[PDB]
C-alpha cells in the first residue's frame, strides 16, 4: 500500500527566546521510504541532521530531522516534506515495564532506486543498537553499551551472516515479484523479535510484509504460517513443508531471543531501567495547549479535564514524540460556559500530575 506521512514540528527543550534549543521535525507513518525533509527559516533552507531510517511494527517508516541549534529570536521556522502520496510539498510551521528486542529487515527490488537494496536494524526497547546496509556491508553498533560490551569478533561474525541474509532477501524478493506478476519498485520487510513482560511472561513474533502490507505471519505455538493472499499462500505451503525450520524458529523466539534480550538488558541497565518524570507546561493561543517534556519510558497518559472530568470532544492526541536526548515529549489540545476550570492531567510513574490551566 501507500501511506502519507504524518508531520510534527517541535523543540527539544521549552524555548526561552535566548536559550539555543533543538528544532525537531518528526516525520512518521509513511510508506514507501522515498522521502526528503527540509527545515526552513522564513522560507530559507537550513542545514539539518537526519537520523537513520527506522521502522515501526505496522511496517511504516519514521525519521527524526533536527537542526543543530535554534535560539528562536523572533523568526519563522517551518518544515518541508515531499512524498509520493503528495501532489504539492506539505508545509508545517513551528509555533510556540515490559522490555523487548526487535530485528527488522528492509528489502528493495532491483535496481537501487537510490535506496540501499538491503537494510537490517536491531532495537531493544526502541533503542537502536545494530545497523547494516548493502552499501557499506558492516555490523555496526548504534548504542555505546553495545560496542563496549561486545568484542570485535562478534561484529565480524554477524557481518558475515548479514551478507548471507542480504543475498537471501534479494532472491526472496525476485521470487515474490515473479509470483505477483509485476516488476519495478517494490519493497520487502521482515520483523522478528521477543519481549519480556514484568511478571516473567514472554512472547515472540515473526512477520513478513510486501509493499508495506502484511504478507506472512508466523505462529510459534501451532507451528504454522498465516497468509492473507492467494500469492502468500504459495510461500506458506513451501515454508510449512519444512517442519524442521518451523521448529527451529520456535526455539529461537522462545529460548535464544530471550537469552539475547536479558544479555543486552544487563549491558544497558543504566539507560533502560531509568525513569525520568515529565515537565508539564500549559499555553493558550479558544485553544489550550498542554505539553510534557523529557520523560522516560515512553509509556505516558495525558488528557485535558473540565470540572474535572475528561474531555473527549474537540481534542487532539499528539502521540509520543522523540525528544532527542533519549527522552520523549507529547501534547494535548482542546478548543473552548461560565466559571469552568480547565486543567491538564498527566500520569507517568503514576504519580498523577495536574496543572490548572484556565478559569473565568
Amino acid at each position: 500500500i501507500q501511506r502519507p506521512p504524518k508531520i510534527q514540528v517541535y523543540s527539544r527543550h521549552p524555548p526561552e527566546d535566548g536559550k539555543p534549543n533543538y528544532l525537531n521535525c518528526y516525520v512518521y507513518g509513511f510508506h514507501p521510504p522515498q522521502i526528503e525533509i527540509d527545515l526552513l527559516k522564513n522560507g530559507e533552507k537550513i542545514k539539518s541532521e537526519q537520523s537513520d531510517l527506522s521502522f515501526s511494527k505496522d511496517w511504516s517508516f519514521y525519521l527524526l530531522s533536527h537542526a543543530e541549534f535554534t535560539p528562536n529570536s523572533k523568526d519563522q521556522y517551518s518544515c518541508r516534506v515531499k512524498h509520493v502520496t503528495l501532489e504539492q510539498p506539505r508545509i508545517v510551521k513551528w509555533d510556540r515495564r515490559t522490555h523487548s528486542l526487535r530485528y527488522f529487515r528492509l528489502g528493495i527490488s532491483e535496481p537501487g532506486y537510490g535506496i540501499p537494496e538491503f537494510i537490517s536494524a536491531g532495537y531493544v526497547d526502541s533503542h537502536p543498537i545494530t545497523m547494516y546496509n548493502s552499501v557499506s556491508q558492516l555490523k555496526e553498533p548504534r548504542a555505546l553499551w553495545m560496542e563496549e560490551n561486545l568484542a570485535p569478533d562478534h561484529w565480524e561474525r554477524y557481518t558475515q551472516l548479514l551478507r548471507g541474509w542480504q543475498q537471501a532477501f534479494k532472491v526472496e524478493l525476485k521470487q515474490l515479484q515473479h509470483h505477483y506478476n509485476h516488476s519495478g519498485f517494490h519493497t520487502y520487510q521482515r520483523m522478528i523479535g521477543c519481549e519480556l513482560l514484568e511478571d516473567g511472561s514472554i512472547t515472540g513474533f515473526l512477520q513478513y510484509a510486501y509493499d508495506g502490507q502484511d504478507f506472512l505471519i508466523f505462529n510459534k505455538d501451532t507451528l504454522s504460517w498465516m497468509a492473507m493472499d492467494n500469492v502468500a499462500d504459495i510461500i506458506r505451503r513451501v515454508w510449512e513443508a519444512n517442519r524442521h525450520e518451523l521448529q527451529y524458529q520456535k526455539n529461537w523466539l522462545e529460548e535464544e531471543c530471550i537469552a539475547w534480550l536479558k544479555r543486552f538488558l544487563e549491558y544497558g541497565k543504566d539507560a533502560l531501567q531509568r525513569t525520568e518524570p515529565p515537565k508539564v507546561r500549559v499555553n493558550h493561543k479558544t485553544t489550550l495547549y498542554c505539553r510534557a517534556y523529557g520523560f522516560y519510558p515512553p509509556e505516558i497518559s495525558i488528557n485535558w479535564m473540565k470540572n474535572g472530568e475528561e474531555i473527549f470532544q474537540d481534542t487532539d492526541y499528539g502521540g509520543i514524540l522523540p525528544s532527542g536526548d533519549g527522552t520523549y515529549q507529547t501534547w494535548v489540545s482542546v478548543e473552548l460556559q461560565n466559571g469552568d476550570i480547565y486543567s491538564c492531567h498527566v500520569e507517568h510513574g503514576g504519580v498523577h500530575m495536574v496543572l490548572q490551566g484556565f478559569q473565568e
Partner: antibody, heavy 108, light 115 residues
Framework: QNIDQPTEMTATEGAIVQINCTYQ??????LFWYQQHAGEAPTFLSY??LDGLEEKGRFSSFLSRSKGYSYLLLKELQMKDSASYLC??????????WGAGTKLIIKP | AGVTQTPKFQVLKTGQSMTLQCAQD?????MYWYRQDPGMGLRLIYY???????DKGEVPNGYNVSRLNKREFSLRLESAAPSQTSVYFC??????????????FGEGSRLTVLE
C-alpha cells in the same frame, strides 16, 4: 564450547544400539547427527531443536535441551550401519561445533 | 547432482603449493572447507556465506581460499607442511544462519605431506 560422545561401540546384526551425545555450548540452535562410512562423505541423518523424539525409519534421535543430552537410536542393525556417527550442535552464533564421532562396529 | 571434489589423493613434498577444486551442482549459496583428523571432530578452515564474501574459520593458519563462482570454492595451500596431512572435505549448504539447513559433503580429499 564442548561436546562429547563414545569413541567406539560394538553390536551384533539385528540388535539395537544407542549412541549418547552430551554438549555444553553458549546457546543452542539445533543438534545434527551425521553418518560417515569409512573413506566416504558424511551424510545428514537427523536433526533436533525442540525437546522430544524424532523418528525416521530405523533411525531415531532424542534431545533434552535442559540436560544438554542427545541419543541416536538405531533399531534392527544391518551390516551397512557400521560407520562413524558424528554429533554436531549449532552455537549461539550460527557456528557449528563437531564432536569426534562414534565408530560403530557391526558383527554379523 | 552432488558436491564434486578433486582430487581424492595427493602426495606433496614440504614446501609445495597445491589447490583443491570443489564444485556444487545443487545451486547452493554457502560453501565450506573442513579438515578431518583422527581423535578430533571436524574443524572449519575457511568458509563463504555467498559469492563475493569469504571468512576465516576455526583453523585458518596456512590456508587460503577463493570463491570463483556460485558453484566453485577452491582451497589453496601455498607452502605445504607435514602438519597439514589430513582428509579435507568440501561442504555445501543452501544458506548460512539458517537453523535446520543440513550440510552436503564431497567425497573427500586425502592429503599426505612428506619431507
Amino acid at each position: 564450547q564442548n561436546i562429547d560422545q563414545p569413541t567406539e561401540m560394538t553390536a551384533t546384526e539385528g540388535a539395537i544400539v544407542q549412541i549418547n551425545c552430551t554438549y555444553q555450548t553458549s546457546g543452542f540452535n539445533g543438534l545434527f547427527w551425521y553418518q560417515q562410512h569409512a573413506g566416504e562423505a558424511p551424510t545428514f541423518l537427523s536433526y533436533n531443536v525442540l525437546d522430544g523424539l524424532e523418528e525416521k525409519g530405523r533411525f531415531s534421535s532424542f534431545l533434552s535441551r535442559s540436560k544438554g543430552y542427545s541419543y541416536l537410536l538405531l533399531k534392527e542393525l544391518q551390516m551397512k550401519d557400521s560407520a562413524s556417527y558424528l554429533c554436531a550442535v549449532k552455537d549461539s552464533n550460527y557456528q557449528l561445533i563437531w564432536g569426534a564421532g562414534t565408530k560403530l562396529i557391526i558383527k554379523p | 547432482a552432488g558436491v564434486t571434489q578433486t582430487p581424492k589423493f595427493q602426495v606433496l613434498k614440504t614446501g609445495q603449493s597445491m589447490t583443491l577444486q570443489c564444485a556444487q551442482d545443487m545451486n547452493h549459496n554457502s560453501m565450506y572447507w573442513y579438515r578431518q583428523d583422527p581423535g578430533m571432530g571436524l574443524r572449519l578452515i575457511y568458509y563463504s556465506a555467498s559469492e563475493g564474501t569469504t571468512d576465516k574459520g576455526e583453523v585458518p593458519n596456512g590456508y587460503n581460499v577463493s570463491r570463483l563462482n556460485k558453484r566453485e570454492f577452491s582451497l589453496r595451500l601455498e607452502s605445504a607442511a607435514p602438519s597439514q596431512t589430513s582428509v579435507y572435505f568440501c561442504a555445501s549448504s543452501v544458506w548460512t544462519g539458517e537453523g535446520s539447513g543440513e550440510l552436503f559433503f564431497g567425497e573427500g580429499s586425502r592429503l599426505t605431506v612428506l619431507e
